[PDB]
From a paper:
SMARCAD1 is a chromatin remodeler, a member of the SWI2/SNF2-like family of enzymes that couple ATP hydrolysis to repositioning, ejecting, or restructuring nucleosomes. KAP1 (also known as TRIM28 and TIF1β) is the major interaction partner of SMARCAD1, with the two proteins forming a tight complex (Okazaki et al., 2008, Rowbotham et al., 2011). The SMARCAD1-KAP1 interaction is direct and involves the first SMARCAD1 CUE domain (CUE1) and the RBCC domain of KAP1. Remarkably, CUE1, a canonical CUE domain, recognizes a cluster of exposed hydrophobic and surrounding charged/amphipathic residues on KAP1, which are presented in the context of a coiled-coil domain, not in a structure resembling ubiquitin.
Author numbering:
A (entry chain B): 146 to 202
B (entry chain D): 151 to 203
C (entry chain A): 59 to 94, 113 to 137, 204 to 408
D (entry chain F): 59 to 94, 113 to 137, 203 to 409
Amino acid sequence: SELEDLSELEDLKDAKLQTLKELFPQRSDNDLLKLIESTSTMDGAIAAALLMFGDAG
Amino acid sequence: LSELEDLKDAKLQTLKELFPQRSDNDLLKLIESTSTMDGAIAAALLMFGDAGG
Amino acid sequence: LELLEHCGVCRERLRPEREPRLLPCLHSACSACLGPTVVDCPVCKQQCFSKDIVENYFMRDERTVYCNVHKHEPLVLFCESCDTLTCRDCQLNAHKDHQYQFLEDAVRNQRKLLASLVKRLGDKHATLQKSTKEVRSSIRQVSDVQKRVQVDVKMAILQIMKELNKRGRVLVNDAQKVTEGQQERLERQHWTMTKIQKHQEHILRFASWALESDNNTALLLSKKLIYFQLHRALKMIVDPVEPHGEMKFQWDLNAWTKSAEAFGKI
Amino acid sequence: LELLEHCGVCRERLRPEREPRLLPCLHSACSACLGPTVVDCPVCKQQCFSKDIVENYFMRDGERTVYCNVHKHEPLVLFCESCDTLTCRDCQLNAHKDHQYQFLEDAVRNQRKLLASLVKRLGDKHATLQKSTKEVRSSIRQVSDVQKRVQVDVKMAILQIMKELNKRGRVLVNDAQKVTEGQQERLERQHWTMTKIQKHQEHILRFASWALESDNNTALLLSKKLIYFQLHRALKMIVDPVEPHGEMKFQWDLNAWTKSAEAFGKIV
Ligand SMILES: [Zn+2]
Ligand SMILES: [Zn+2]
Ligand SMILES: [Zn+2]
Ligand SMILES: [Zn+2]
Ligand SMILES: [Zn+2]
Ligand SMILES: [Zn+2]
Ligand SMILES: [Zn+2]
Ligand SMILES: [Zn+2]
């Protein structure tokens, strides 16, 4: 059961990564990942951090 | 006691100075009723009788 | 001055023929000013019966007045045993070998004693004339004390209001900061939703057109099912669910009005 | 609609001669719009190397035929089920020898019927977002109106507290005012006394002064009234008033307890 929950968690992280790609796409994936881990994967706090380092559009 | 008599008569003459029309026997009863305070006597004088300058 | 010389109600000049009389209260008026038992003053009281009323003798510019009894024999002499004056006949009659004196010496002595009386009484009426202004200023001073307390109270009130509005608007700035931080979050979230909806709407619009053209296009279409379904996995788990920040700032206004009135009464 | 058929920078109609390529982000543009390692999108990003960039095949209305990658003029018509894509007859004999296999006609029907299911599901999902957009848009207006209204509620409650407090203070002020003017009217009798006494003394005094100053054949007129001059001089000699002093306690009747005021104002 714990392995099933882990394989779910993986997709849960990847989906938020895909949203980041839809939003600000030009920054590398290896860059977005360190931040979605930093944020502990909050759907809006991730986006706020994305606005933080990078630029302002 | 001959001092207290002049002490009373002084205030009596002062009342005659203030309101003179009122008789003397009348003013005596009031200077006794007040126990001879300088101003409370003038107050009780405004009380009964004319009370205007 | 202008009022002493004149009479009572008529204010006529001192006419000696007017037989003017002088009251125990020292006013002077002709017996043609007031006629009627005990006689009273135009200013003071009926301070005495008519029996103690002397006619005013003021005959300006008849220097002489003659004795009561011995008719035309004038008084000049001073009966030292009777405090008053007599003519030569009474000092041979009534005051025979009564100890005797002349006018000059007793007049000088009486003037010198009355002048002393007058001087000391003037020095005392001067204390009156000064204590009058003293109490007159004390009255304005007490009235000013009332007014100055009236202002002191209001200014203590207003200083209390000042520091209170400081300590109240400092707490109001908390409502400012919160409301605008929650609104910063709401702006962020609406912005995210709008930009993501537009990316999804572009993806959806293009895919929808590309599919709806399915007449004689199966050749062109079948070449791209891979990347179609790839961006469909992109828009499939797009991963945003609307949270809602509940309103509990309604339960943050400290409205204890009863405590306020209780402390403001005293 | 008007935007898909057209190209990238030039917005040319889909010219098959234009060699239009299709990027991973699904936009389309001719290789004459963007030439340059990893190639990026005019809208999105460099989502993929140029290696994963296929050319757009949209030659509308006689190229219903598209020809295979390897076997030259042998066109792709067949679908390799084991490779998710298409091949011509030859690839299915060589590369896809006995590889699980499907024909276009059945695979196209089934694939259209499955992609339409995916599309209907994603459309019914995106409707909920086209609704939640307006949802949050109105939530902003409601949150801002409620923020302004709570911001005004606090202020108006404070103002009402202040109104009633000022009433209840000004009341005690008027009370002290009534007390003070009562006390002054009571102490006022002393000026009354002083004035009337001064008048009697001034009458007598006027008289005395004139009486002495006239001395020409007035020893007679004067000598008669020494007794009554000294009698009303006994009247004005013992006049009998002593000035009292009303102590000032109006300085110690202001309730200056400010330390309590600040304490009760801190919390609210
Ligand atoms: Zn007259
Ligand atoms: Zn009089
Ligand atoms: Zn004699
Ligand atoms: Zn004689
Ligand atoms: Zn172009
Ligand atoms: Zn793009
Ligand atoms: Zn195959
Ligand atoms: Zn082939």
